[PDB]
Amino acid sequence: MTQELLEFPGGVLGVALNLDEHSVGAVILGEFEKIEEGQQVKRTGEVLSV
Amino acid sequence: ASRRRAMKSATDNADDLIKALTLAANRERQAQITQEISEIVGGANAL
Amino acid sequence: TMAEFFRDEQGQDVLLFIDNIFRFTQAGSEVSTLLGRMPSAVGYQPTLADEMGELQERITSTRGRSITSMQAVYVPADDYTDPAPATTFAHLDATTELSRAVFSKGIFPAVDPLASSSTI
Amino acid sequence: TAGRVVRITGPVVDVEFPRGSVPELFNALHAEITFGALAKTLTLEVAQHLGDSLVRCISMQPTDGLVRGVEVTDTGASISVPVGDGVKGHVFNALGDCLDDPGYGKDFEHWSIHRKPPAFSDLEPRTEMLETGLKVVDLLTPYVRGGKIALFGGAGVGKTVLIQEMINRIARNFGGTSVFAGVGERTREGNDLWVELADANVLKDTALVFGQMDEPPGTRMRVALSALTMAEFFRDEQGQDVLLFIDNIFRFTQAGSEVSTLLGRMPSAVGYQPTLADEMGELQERITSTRGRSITSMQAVYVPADDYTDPAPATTFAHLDATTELSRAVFSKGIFPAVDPLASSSTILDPAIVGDEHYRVAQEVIRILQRYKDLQDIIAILGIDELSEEDKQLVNRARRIERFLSQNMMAAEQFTGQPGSTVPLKETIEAFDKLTKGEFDHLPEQAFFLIGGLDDLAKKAESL
Amino acid sequence: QVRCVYVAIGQKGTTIASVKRALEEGGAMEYTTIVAAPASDAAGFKWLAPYTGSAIGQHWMYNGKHVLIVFDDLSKQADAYRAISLLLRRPPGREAFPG
Amino acid sequence: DGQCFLESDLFNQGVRPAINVGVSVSRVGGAAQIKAMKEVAGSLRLDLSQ
Amino acid sequence: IEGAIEDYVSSFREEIGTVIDAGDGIAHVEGLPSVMTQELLEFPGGVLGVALNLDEHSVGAVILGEFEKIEEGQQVKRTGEVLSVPVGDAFLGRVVNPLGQPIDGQGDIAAETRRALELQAPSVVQRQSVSEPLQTGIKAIDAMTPIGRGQRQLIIGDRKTGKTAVCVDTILNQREAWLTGDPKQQVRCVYVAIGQKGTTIASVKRALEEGGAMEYTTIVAAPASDAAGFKWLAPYTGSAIGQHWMYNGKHVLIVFDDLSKQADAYRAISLLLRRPPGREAFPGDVFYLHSRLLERCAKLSDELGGGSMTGLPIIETKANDISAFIPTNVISITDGQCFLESDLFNQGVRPAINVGVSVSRVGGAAQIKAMKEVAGSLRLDLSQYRELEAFAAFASDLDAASKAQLDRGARLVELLKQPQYSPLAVEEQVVAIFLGTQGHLDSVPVEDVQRFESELLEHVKASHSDIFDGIRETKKLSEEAEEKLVSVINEFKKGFQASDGSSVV
Amino acid sequence: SKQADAYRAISLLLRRPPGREAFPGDVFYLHSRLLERCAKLSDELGGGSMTGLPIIETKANDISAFIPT
């Protein structure tokens, strides 16, 4: 979903800004030196909330 | 007699301000136009 | 090329007259931008010095024959630091001026001695 | 685990790896050059991924001599540097290899150069005032311990002389372990500094490491990180206060810009990196005095083309507390400590910290100088004749007081052939109060040019 | 009764500590809160903090209590957004800023 | 709805708040302040500017 | 399937490539499995190419010399040699193009090795202090801001001022040092001309021919009629030739005619490759380029041999504006500068040297002890004279208090003027400085002072020359020589006649 | 000026390379093709004539702009 929070294996959280045909762009919030190719991404089914 | 020389020196000193301001204005105009063209070409080529 | 042929075939000294130089650089910049290159240095072609030198290098005198030329250059926006006049003046020897006040005096040459000079 | 080189351009090198294993970010890689005349090994650092098991790396050495098909081996660790008690007293390169005595080391502790700043709960502000023999810095913008000092200025306006004078004063007055670094300095200056420190009998406790001009940008952007790592090691374990010196930080920024154009990222305003604030922030926040450790630093920063509008010093302006500025016009006037009194500002100056008299004196000096600057527009054409005497008195007072700020620091001993001077701040404030009273208008102006104290002032005035 | 919220963007931690000390001396720390986004953090927090502060204030505003909001810096957020947009390959605009 | 301009020249002149009354303005007007203040104080900005 | 790909990669009679692109002096060639960064590629037309880029399937290349000989379908053959220039001890007395081909036409040349154009540089531990004087024929520069061996000095000035005159004067002055056979006092000279008209090069070469000092001079020319490649490479070749004599124990002076033209050519080349621009279309590589070019010049340590190279860059600016990109960068990287402005030149004084801006960071070791002792406080006196002259229309304040100061300023201003093509030695110049400072010429009217000293000078050359030898040997001004010199001055000026025939008293 | 603006809009919409002030290179040529038609004729062809009075608008008393020059 647009602007939907996504979970990452290391415990960091991401946000999907724009949705392309076959790819999804995301921005990392916290520490981002532990991100590599081949990880697993899960959707939380919820929009950015505080 | 003392009065005359003051006006003479005043005009002589006033000319150089015109010269320096003209140089500064020309420099600023050139900088502005080159910045604008650089920005527009960079924007156009990115697509 | 025609003047060079005259000089190198007949041995006669020749004089060359050019009306303007600004239009030459203008046409150069236009043909540069139509080929889809990248502009630089206040909307000018990136290699103007190369063409200017290639044009001016065929004027010097050699082998006992001379090719003297005269040009009339136009300064834009009354700026003497513009790239085109700056590059043009690098190959200049003598400068001459004409005005109307000297003409109002009523003499033939109408040249101001206080505004002309030479490098020799 | 064997890699293959596929594409190279400039100092940036592409590489591919087998699908099974791909090293993480910031892992050193080793390559070799087989050419006979230019044989050399190269160390690479991971920058980013591109997919298809491709990696982009930045070369630590000039890339001339490389060829496709060269095997690449990894170490599975970040760049490491040696740390220990006996490090002080030797010169180092970017990689950490010694220069005076090759082969020395490889038995001390080894730490990486990628760390994190301390937590918020360990932060604490400090307000311990530090004084220096100079009168201009102490009267207007006093220095504070545990913070940061900035020396903004143009090109060729004598920053190095001031740095040398200040470090000499601190080294003579105070001890403790000291660390000197540098980016974008001339080798002649480095040799002169080495000779001077050898003469001064103080180089034993001063750590030295620096890059120079002729180096690929990687060393220029990593020597500072190595220096901070060594300084942090001296700060934490020993529990000792440390002096830190860094010269010409602006060059660092420039280096980054270059590699950005090589990586292919979209340019920003005035052809800079898309991100520059984050790097500056993570570099600056590494320096911070904890409760049990006091660190005092001093950064000299360059200004390009004498234009303050560039983001390079503008971004740095937000991470400083004590700032001094240099101007071209003041230098052209003739006074050598060409410090702008109007533009300079500090954060420690306050009636809560300092007595009321100093505050009042500073305020009055600022007011007089500002009024003179305002009148400068009118005076520049007609002169003093058009103005009234009620402003003539202020003009004369401003001229004399501004001329009084000149001084002859000892760092010019090799230029002016005269000894230095020292002035306690009590004498300074007393003399400035006397001058602001207006009694000293009788004496000629040229007496105050390059004077040490009020006694020397009177002696010079009466001797002429 | 007035409840206030302080938001800081792109400032040194020691400045935030000094502001906290001033508030503590003033004694207002009973009825105030601080949201901190130091410059050492990534671009996401700098871009996101003001919306969090606004939502926090809005929750009390709906309940009928008066709320005061103070933003420290706002150009830093624009710079962070520009950096994010340029990194995301979006086309630029005037003064390299997103449209 | 309103802005305040602060100049360094005024700050060094001697005005500690250093607000420029010539340009600073508030769109809401005198309705916000108490009635006694508007009775005692009124049209002072015009006097300062003139 | 991985093994097949590995064997395909490892499998790789002479390699041949084909041309696919052209235009504006850029080529794209592919098909060379064995690649090499910055290798010289021989095109079938006799022209040369340099590989500044490398891709997966093809490689780009810049071209040198004539570039219209490029057509698609041509075959190109690689050469394993890295870019280099032949270097030898027979190069002196010749004129060559950047690639080393003799262009003068005198004959053929032979070399011994081929040093690379890009190598390492001396470190901090391999250097030494500056303690050797580099004498110059111009007395103004040696009296105001001295120059020593191994120290880079900058010359910045507007057009039509005469920097090449100063360089030619220095080259001529080096002949006296060349005359003796001492290796320690030996000095070689390298001149590099960039983007210059052919007539100027011919004129300077003929001037040197009149000077007769080609036995130690090497000239490299990159005329403006050539392409961008020579205009970008020539200074590097000059630096390599200089460094070859660096690393053998010889003193070298190198002169660059211009550096703005090289920067402009590099900007054109960079913009032709679609790289994003920066300030005034200048990429971020300009500072790196100039730093790499200028950092190679430094005095070596004692153990290695103690060679030295002194560099003379020349920079021109428009409308005397120091605030600019390239001038600021170059003045930042180098140390010391000399300023030449059009105002004094137009007024009438030929050597146009300002006194309030030209400051050199050189130490006092450059000047001889005698020179330091005889001359002192000149710059401050000239600055205060330039401050006082602005009030020459108001004599009601001076009133016989600074009249002697104005007289001294006038005499000193008239003394420092120098003619054309007149190199000067240390002996007569220190004598002239002493005579000017001591104020003996206060009586002589300004309209003739010059000729007077010249006569005096040659008279001292006709009379006893023991004082010259004495102050040449001990490098100091002995007192008895001072009384002898003042006595000679008195005797000469008693019998000396002025322009109007009034004897000085 | 309006004609030049319309031509610039068409050229930009047709995806052609731009130049200084977002103007196509050939724009100058355009004017040379239009304003040069009018000229005096000789008596051989009848001696016709044509006179043109183009009008240009400038802003802020500025003459150094592209089209005015």
Ligand SMILES: Nc1ncnc2c1ncn2[C@@H]1O[C@H](COP(=O)(O)OP(=O)(O)OP(=O)(O)O)[C@@H](O)[C@H]1O
């Ligand atoms: N107090 C002083 N007395 C005499 N000369 C001085 C004084 N301060 C500076 N100078 C002169 O000014 C120059 C300063 O040189 P220095 O190497 O310090 O320059 P810098 O401005 O720090 O360098 P950069 O251009 O690399 O930033 C020298 O020529 C020095 O002699």
Ligand SMILES: Nc1ncnc2c1ncn2[C@@H]1O[C@H](COP(=O)(O)OP(=O)(O)OP(=O)(O)O)[C@@H](O)[C@H]1O
């Ligand atoms: N001592 C001197 N006496 C007389 N004329 C002099 C003297 N020194 C220089 N000149 C004059 O200066 C010029 C020599 O300099 P030159 O023509 O090479 O120009 P430049 O200032 O070096 O610049 P550029 O390379 O742009 O021509 C000649 O016009 C020469 O007459």
Ligand SMILES: [Mg+2]
């Ligand atoms: Mg410096």
Ligand SMILES: [Mg+2]
């Ligand atoms: Mg010349």
